Amino acid sequence: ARQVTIIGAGLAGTLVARLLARNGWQVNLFERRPDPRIETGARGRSINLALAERGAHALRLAGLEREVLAEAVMMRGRMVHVPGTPPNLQPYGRDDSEVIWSINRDRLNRILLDGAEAAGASIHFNLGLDSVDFARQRLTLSNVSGERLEKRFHLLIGADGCNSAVRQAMASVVDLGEHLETQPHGYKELQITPEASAQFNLEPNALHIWPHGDYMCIALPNLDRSFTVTLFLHHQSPAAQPASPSFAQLVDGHAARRFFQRQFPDLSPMLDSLEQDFEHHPTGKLATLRLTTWHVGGQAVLLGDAAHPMVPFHGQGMNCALEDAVALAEHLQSAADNASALAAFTAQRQPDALAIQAMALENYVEMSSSPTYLLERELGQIMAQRQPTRFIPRYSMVTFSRLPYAQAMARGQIQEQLLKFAVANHSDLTSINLDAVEHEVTRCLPPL
Ligand SMILES: Cc1cc2nc3c(=O)[nH]c(=O)nc-3n(C[C@H](O)[C@H](O)[C@H](O)COP(=O)(O)OP(=O)(O)OC[C@H]3O[C@@H](n4cnc5c(N)ncnc54)[C@H](O)[C@@H]3O)c2cc1C
Ligand SMILES: Cc1cc2oc(=O)n(CCC(=O)O)c2cc1Cl
Ligand SMILES: [Cl-]
């Protein structure tokens, strides 16, 4: 049996552990944190994520989708909250088969850990990777106290997240060609209780947005009707706009309350613990990191956030990481050798990771925001009705299909240009030649 060591019992690492172990690989998975399945007297994490077709299909192949979906809340569409305007649901898809799912992060991780162990993987917690000696095929791990443990390895999978220690170790033997693009927004997680969401009639089966241009809030529902709210706001005010809101200006919880009361007046009343959440929850960092190299020969490979940190504005990081896990297990299982598998995995996935990194950055303006937009949207709707196998909105290709991300981006660009051009020099739809637009659709977009 082929042997593998995986660092990081997160989402990608645990899924690839199950896929490899059920294929008979001898799998050892090392995780820095304690086992979340061991109940303690500490409060659980209320962090949630959007699960879409890419992630769901990966779980489906693993035999875990039904268990995960049992505690997921359907989000049928986007509920936009702008003061004055009553909220009205904007469906994401054609019917309830085209929805996204809000799931608790910790619950997803527990289901994945049980799945990896059921398939035969051995999981070792409270062990953080510190260093790798590639030439001697050994690695060093340690607990929080620095007590060290050395292990021999044969194949190393870095599934250890955006600040990957495997990635840092690879940088000692290969030039990874790393390009970091910092994101100016930080984020803060806040809570809406079940009592508060019910009192204010907040729709449970939707993804909620409070757009505000350079900043915004989103809220994803939980099974118990609580919601996890995330504020996206610049860490610092840029030199050009010193008066612009930023985390730097919010010196404490009371300042955060005044800011919410002024900028998000319909949201502030639902945030009962705003002051405490603001002071006790750390402000998170966002970034895009692009690597030219994801592997060291046949010895080590990165996947998920370890390989391609992205901004979260499309809710695709976990979805992409699970898709990566399926691809890596498929390549490893059937390749001539590990070196061939890692090179083929990297060549296949890199263009797709670049595409979702670009589309995630673009989705910020789509969420945080015109008569031109409405006309383009209406025209796009007619084209989708006339040609459902050719004109598929980019959001649907990314979220409800398994089309390679690079193809979703390429077709999305064709559609965006087609609409932009067709609406240019037009006041309304009545002056637009729909057949000429449809001719462009049949000419430029092959049926899927
Ligand atoms: C604000 C925000 C919202 C998001 N919302 C969504 C969403 O709605 N939908 C979506 O698809 N994605 C979302 N994402 C992205 C998603 O959280 C990540 O893309 C995803 O968790 C990556 O999975 P992963 O397994 O690669 O890494 P992780 O899930 O981060 O797992 C890495 C694991 O490695 C462990 N580890 C780290 N360092 C070491 C070490 N040295 N040794 C051993 N173990 C180590 C960690 O403890 C962890 O268990 C969001 C991200 C952010 C920041
Ligand atoms: C954390 C997060 C998760 C998400 O899941 C998604 O599908 N989106 C896009 C929603 C839309 O454009 O309406 C999304 C955005 C964020 Cl910031
Ligand atoms: Cl994301």
- Domain locations along the chain: 1-369, 370-448
Sign of the torsion formed by the C-alpha atoms of 176, 181, 186 and 192: negative
Q: Whose CA is nearest to atom 48 of ligand 1?
A: 10
Length, in residues, of the chain:
448
**Contact call for residues 428 and 376 (beta carbons, < 8 A):** no
11 CA to centre of ligand 1 in angstroms: 7
State how far the Cα of 233 lies from the Cα of 187, in Å rounded to an integer.
6
CA dist., res. 130 & res. 160, Å (int): 12
d(CA 338, CA 297) in angstroms, rounded, equals 8
Pocket of ligand 2 (CB under 6 A): 50, 78, 100, 207, 218, 312-315, 363, 366-367
> Ligand 1 centroid to 264 CA: how many Å?
29
Q: Is 89 helix (H, G, I), strand (E, B) or coil?
A: strand
Rounded Cα distance, 243 and 125, in Å: 46
Which of 123, 207, 305 maximizes ligand 1 atoms within 8 Å of its Cβ, making it the mutation to test the pocket? 305
Q: What are phi and psi of 182, to 5 degrees?
A: -70, 150
Of all protein residues, the one whose alpha carbon is nearest to atom 53 of ligand 1 is 312
* Nearest CA owner, ligand 2 atom 9: 314
Q: Is 356 helix (H, G, I), strand (E, B) or coil?
A: helix
Task: Establish whether 31 is an annotated binding residue.
Answer: yes
Q: Report the atom number in ligand 2 closest to the C-alpha of 50.
A: 5
9 C-beta closer than 6 A to ligand 1: yes
Long-range contacts formed by 373-378: CB under 8 A, 24+ apart? 375/423, 375/426, 375/428, 375/429, 376/419, 376/420, 376/423, 378/429
| DSSP-derived secondary structure for 117-144 | HHTT-EEE-S-EEEEEETTTTEEEEE-T
Nearest alpha carbon, ligand 2 atom 6 = 315
323 CB less than 6 Å from ligand 1? no
Closest CA to 12 of 238, 226, 307, 241: 307
Q: Which two tokens stand for residue 83?
A: 């003061």
- Whether 117 and 31 have beta carbons less than 8 Å apart is answered as no
Ligand nearest to the CA of 304: 1
Instruction: Name the residue among 31, 12, 30, 28 with its Cα closest to residue 328.
Output: 12
User: Residue 394, annotated ligand binder?
Assistant: no
Helix (H/G/I), strand (E/B), else coil: 93:
coil
- Give yes or no for a contact between 162 and 11, defined as CB atoms under 8 angstroms apart: no
Q: 303: phi > 0 → left, psi -120 to 50 → alpha, else beta; which?
A: beta
Ligand closest to CA 398: 2
Q: Which ligand is nearest to the CA of 127?
A: 1
Pick the ligand that lies closest to the CA of residue 11.
Answer: 1
Beta bridge partners of 391: none
Residue 318 assigned to a binding site: yes
Q: What is the distance of C-alpha 193 from the center of its chain?
A: 24
What atom of ligand 2 comes closest to residue 52's alpha carbon?
A: 7
Write the class of the CATH domain 1-369: alpha beta
Decide if 232 contacts 217 (C-beta within 8 A).
yes
Query: How far does residue 312's CA lie from ligand 2's centre (Å)?
Result: 7
Structure token digits, residue 245: 């809101």
Q: Is any ligand 1 atom within 6 A of the Cβ of residue 304?
A: yes
- Report the SS3 class of residue 422: helix
**Which ligand 1 atom sits closest to the C-alpha of 10?**
31
Dist CA 243 CA 263 (whole Å): 14
Q: Are 301 and 293 in contact (CB under 8 A)?
A: no
Structure tokens at 268: 């502030």
Residue burial 265-301, b: 16+ Cβ < 10 Å; e: rest:
eebbebbeebeebbeeeeeeebebbbbebbbbebbbb
With beta carbons less than 8 A apart as the criterion, state whether 185 and 238 touch.
no
> 316 CA distance to ligand 3 centroid (A)?
4
CA of 384 to the centre of ligand 2 (A): 22
Which residues are within 8 A (CB) of 293 and not within 5 positions of it... i.e. 6 or more apart? 170, 174, 175, 176, 177, 346
Does residue 12 contact residue 324 with C-beta atoms inside 8 Å?
A: yes
Q: 3-class SS at 16?
A: helix
Rounded Cα gap, residues 17 and 235, in angstroms: 37
